[PDB]
Every structure is written in C-alpha cells, then in structure tokens.
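Hey team,

Filing this mostly as a record. A colleague (T.K.) asked me to run one chain through the structure pipeline before their review meeting, and I want the input and output archived in the tracker in case anyone asks later how it was produced. No errors, nothing strange. Just documentation.

Input sequence:
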Amino acid sequence: MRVGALDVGEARIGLAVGEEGVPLASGRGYLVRKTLEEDVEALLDFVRREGLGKLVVGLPLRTDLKESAQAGKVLPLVEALRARGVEVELWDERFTTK
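Output structure:
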C-alpha cells in the first residue's frame, strides 16, 4: 500500500510514500527543482528502486487540447509511468465539500 506523492511550493518538492489515504501527511524526503529529464531520473531512481509502482500528484493544470504540462515539469514523468504500465493519477483540488 505504498504510493509516491509529489508536491511543490515554489522551489522545494515534497516527497511522500505510504497509503493513498493519509490524515497526518506522510513523507519520506524531498528534491530540489531540476530539468525535465533530470526530474524523471530522480523520480525513477526512487519510484523504480523503491518499488512504489504507483504515483500520485496534485496540480491545478490549465487544461487544453494543444500544448499542456503548465507549470512544473511533472508531466515528463507521468508519461514514463503510464508508458511503463505504472499506476498514476493527478490529484484534483485538495479542499472540497463531500
């Protein structure tokens, strides 16, 4: 029941690994912003070796048919995961009434 969690405020990226649902927050480490391929390299090293086999990441996303991956070079990884048959799903808005 381990899942990779990614977060970024405006310089530092948070790393978390545990069950999908978590009240406290759950973590593991952190990685500084890098390039497109670079982030993948760092992510794979952990996701691949850690045997997570699943990654979750929240992002506003501008949404648009042509061009995408607005803000943060996170998309570059999502493609790798999807291609390698790795479970992944973008987390919508954090706050929301049931």
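Quick notes for T.K.: The domain at 1-98 is CATH 3.30.420.140 (Nucleotidyltransferase; domain 5). The helical segments are 36-50, 75-83.
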